[PDB]
Design a protein around this ligand. Sequence first.
Ligand SMILES: [C]SC1=NC(N2[C][C]O[C][C]2[C])=[C]C(C2([S+](=[N])(=[N])=O)[C][C]2)=N1
Length: 249
Amino acid sequence: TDPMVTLSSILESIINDMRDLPNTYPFHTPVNAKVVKDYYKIITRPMDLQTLRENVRKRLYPSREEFREHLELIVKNSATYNGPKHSLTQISQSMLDLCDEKLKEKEDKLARLEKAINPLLDDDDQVAFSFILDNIVTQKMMAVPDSWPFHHPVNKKFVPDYYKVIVNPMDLETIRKNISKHKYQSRESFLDDVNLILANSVKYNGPESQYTKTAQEIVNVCYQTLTEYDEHLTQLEKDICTAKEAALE
Ligand SMILES: [C]SC1=NC(N2[C][C]O[C][C]2[C])=[C]C(C2([S+](=[N])(=[N])=O)[C][C]2)=N1
């Protein structure tokens, strides 16, 4: 029994339940951008239930977190385009609320499937490594003064030309989401994403901008803290690499 198949059946059943909620039809299929002519000038990451379902069938979601992140895009896009209190946004929120109810009902079964799909989710050294990285982001990097421009993805509605300049965006919330998915097995991949924040600031704001000085401070405190914990992090990375190669069945 392939655990990815079992997981995908669970996620598909949640989509069926969400589709059945009242007034949800505007979210069943992609927005038609030839009718909503300014949609892509406002929205960067379109999402809908049909695309979500086809992604499940493409086996793109190895865990509930990747699934839920795409589902939350439906709400975020509606809040941006239609408005935070618009009925469409309330409707989209009702779908996300139902998903969270179903995920909580099945949390123990989902945990077992997710660890069967990716054993590193159960590895104590991966969990400890990710916990340290998350604390560096929240306690050190997000605490840099005036670091707010880098905390969250840029909303195209408020910075309309941002993604015409920046094609590979990165922000601290996205890094935190990656940590919670245990995307990082060593400092190298983590530092690639951290440095993308700075590189994008140099490109969009310029090398001498106050925004870039803040991004430089964020990168520097990251290096400084990784150095302080270097002995511990090195042992974690070694033990993660051993566990990752033991997952060769
Ligand atoms: C001027 S408003 C703004 N500027 C931002 N940055 C990004 C870094 O370069 C400078 C400037 C373009 C970022 C944000 C976000 S937000 N969701 N509103 O759009 C909080 C994330 N707002």
